[PDB]
Amino acid sequence: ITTPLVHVASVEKGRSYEDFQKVYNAIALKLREDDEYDNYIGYGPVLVRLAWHISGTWDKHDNTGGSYGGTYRFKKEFNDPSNAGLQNGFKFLEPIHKEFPWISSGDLFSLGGVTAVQEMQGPKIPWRCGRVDTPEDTTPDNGRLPDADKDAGYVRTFFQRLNMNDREVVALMGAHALGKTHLKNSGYEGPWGAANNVFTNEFYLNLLNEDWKLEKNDANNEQWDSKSGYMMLPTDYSLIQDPKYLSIVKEYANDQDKFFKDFSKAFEKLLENGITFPKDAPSPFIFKTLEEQGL
Ligand code: HEM
């Protein structure tokens, strides 16, 4: 009776690679322009978190949620407590959408994350168009995104719902090299590392090389703190408490190139979960950075 929905990707009318490269460039140029945001971190990290949160609502068992429908634009999902702070990323993308009103919301949200990773010198992320806006009654209920106050067993079980295995989980969590936690958003405070708007394997290096102490923060949540001024969420630290995760953490801490390759695959997969692509669909696009274009 409850059969899994099938969401078929549909290319926006008469649009192709050059069209989306222009959208990429507008995102990337505004990222360069609005350098002051969040004490000069810039909008890169929040756009990556936005792309992850609009995708991480997916439930593989009935194909509800996921990036396809662009449902973060609706009040119920926009106001999810797990999404506190992402309003800044939505407001950043509003002038992009006014300039390119033909792009679907899901395509714009997911492309924002790809642009941010690449412009912060991360790996190329192949990206496919064709997400189609769906009505407000398709918006997933709050509560599908993960709790940070949990252990490795919770992390492993949670990501099963997104069809992610151990390697994919550890790779995806490496995005916590970016940005920081804000007490007002999540009840956690502090960055994970020093180079907060450059995409590197710093997350794994800090996990393994810093001396961490479990401490209460000003919101009375416990987090792991180092003397360097970095922090780790409980779920972050669980990647070195669990023996299978620890092996992969060590692998990425020693080999940023392998991390980049695995992150690129898993992040594209995360953004595409729940979408059926016709065999006649165009191949994934690899957008050029502003630097590669002399822009
Ligand atoms: C168990 C899984 C995860 C948990 C529990 C988690 C939790 C969190 C929390 C609590 C914050 C702080 C938000 C704030 O206070 O502003 C955060 C930020 C962030 N998350 Fe994660 N996250 C997870 C996985 C991911 C994944 C898979 C990605 C991307 C691939 C990601 C990307 C980010 C980024 C870039 C930030 C920084 C945002 C900013 O600086 O504004 N996270 N996450």
CA 88 to chain centre: 15
Residue 34, token pair as written in the block: 């609005």
70 and 139 share one domain: yes
262 and 276 share one domain: no
Which sign does the torsion angle of CA 100, 89, 65, 165 carry? positive
Residue 97, token pair as written in the block: 């959408």
Q: Rounded CA gap, 169 and 152, in Å?
A: 11
259 and 271 share one domain: no
Task: Determine contact, residues 170/249, Cβ cutoff 8 Å.
Answer: yes
Q: Rounded CA gap, 132 and 153, in Å?
A: 35
One-letter identity of residue 31:
L
SS3 call for 276: strand
Tell me which of 49, 150, 178, 273 to substitute to probe ligand 1's pocket, judged by most ligand atoms within 8 Å of the beta carbon: 49
CA 259 to ligand 1 centroid distance, Å = 18
Instruction: Give the CATH number, domain containing residue 215.
Output: 1.10.420.10
Q: Is there an atom of ligand 1 within 6 Å of 46 CB?
A: yes
139 and 12 share one domain: yes
Q: Which residues contact 218 (CB under 8 A, 6 or more apart)?
A: 183, 189
**How many distinct structural domains can be found in the chain?**
2
Q: Is there an atom of ligand 1 within 6 Å of 47 CB?
A: no
225 and 251 share one domain: yes
Task: Determine contact, residues 244/170, Cβ cutoff 8 Å.
Answer: no
Alpha-helix residue ranges (DSSP H) falling in 35-151: 37-40, 44-55, 75-78, 87-99, 105-119
183 and 251 share one domain: yes
276 and 262 share one domain: no
Residue 19, token pair as written in the block: 């069209």
Ligand 1 atom nearest to CA at 89: 41
Instruction: Give the CATH number, domain containing residue 281.
Output: 1.10.520.10
136 and 39 share one domain: yes
Experimental method: X-ray
| Beta-bridge partners for 213 | 225
Which sign does the torsion angle of CA 51, 29, 264, 85 carry? negative
213 and 197 share one domain: yes
82 and 41 share one domain: yes
209 and 280 share one domain: no
Closest residue by Cα to atom 10, ligand 1, is 186
Q: Rounded CA gap, 184 and 187, in Å?
A: 6
Length of the chain as a residue count: 295
95 and 171 share one domain: no
- Residue ranges making up the domain that contains 281: 5-145+267-295
DSSP E strands: which ranges in 90-236?
180-181, 190-191, 212-216, 222-226, 231-232
CA 139 to chain centre: 19
Which residues fall in the annotated binding site for heme b? 176
Buried-state track 244-266, b at ≥16 Cβ within 10 A, e below 16: ebbebbebbbeebeebbebbbbb
